[PDB]
Amino acid sequence: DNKTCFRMLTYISDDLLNEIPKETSLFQGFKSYLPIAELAIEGVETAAISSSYSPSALKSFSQTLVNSLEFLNIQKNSTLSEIRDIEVEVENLRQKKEKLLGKIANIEQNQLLLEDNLKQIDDRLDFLEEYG
């Protein structure tokens, strides 16, 4: 059952039926990211003795830069994705707004009928009280 409680939280149904129809992947994001997370020994890398003279470690440093440069680009559009995700939320939500605002008009006039339709029977009440 403890195995059934957890089946219950993480259940999801109508959603599955509405999954929206280069793309940098969530996973790719995770990959480029863990190396750069191991900067933890020391997203800005090192820069000081950039001026000294090996041909080869100079390049192995160039690597660190370029695989950090790929990570920032990866991190950049993942953020940039998140932007569109909440950009669509603004749209779906904004139209959910006026649909609902349409319903005020729906019942703003439909209340307008009853208030008028009341009026006539407020009115013929005066008229019948032109008599006992």
């Binding site: 195995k3 957890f6 089946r7 939280l9 993480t10 999801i12 959603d15 599955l16 509405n18 999954e19 929206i20 129809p21 793309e23 992947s25 969530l26 996973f27 790719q28 994001g29 995770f30 990959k31 990211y33 863990l34 997370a37 191991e38 933890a40 991190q75 993942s78 953020t79 994705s81 998140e82 569109r84 995700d85 669509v88």
Partner: protein, 127 residues
């Protein structure tokens, strides 16, 4: 030179607890429930990637939250959820998900590999 889609074997080797923690610390700082989809996932992944049942369970939970929140990312998520459920051994759920993923990108080699591999475990525990 690593893919769009993580191999199922990939999902089986964990992280060094240091590394898992790093991912958390990072989600902590972005702000648990307000953290970026990416960093939240990337922690979930690590969780599913772990071999503790409870870690994994969060991993799925994390992922199902992501799925709820980012329509764009939904297509992808079914795949991680499918891994997640399989790893966790809620196999049917994994068939459920992977079957969904299967329609959208049917021809994907891994979507296939995963569907197929989910199914065996389905029949073989029907023995």
């Amino acid at each position: 030179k690593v893919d769009f889609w993580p191999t199922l074997k990939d999902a089986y080797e964990p992280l060094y607890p240091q590394q898992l923690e790093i991912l958390r610390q990072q989600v902590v700082s972005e702000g648990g429930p307000t953290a970026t989809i990416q960093s939240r996932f990337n922690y979930a992944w690590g969780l599913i990637k772990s071999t503790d049942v409870n870690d994994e369970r969060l991993g799925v939970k994390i992922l199902t939250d992501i799925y709820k929140e980012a329509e764009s990312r939904r297509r992808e998520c079914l795949y991680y959820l499918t891994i997640g459920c399989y790893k966790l051994g809620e196999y049917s759920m994994a068939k459920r998900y992977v079957d969904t993923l299967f329609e959208h990108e049917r021809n994907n080699k891994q979507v296939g590999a995963l569907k197929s591999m989910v199914e065996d475990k389905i029949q073989k525990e029907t023995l």
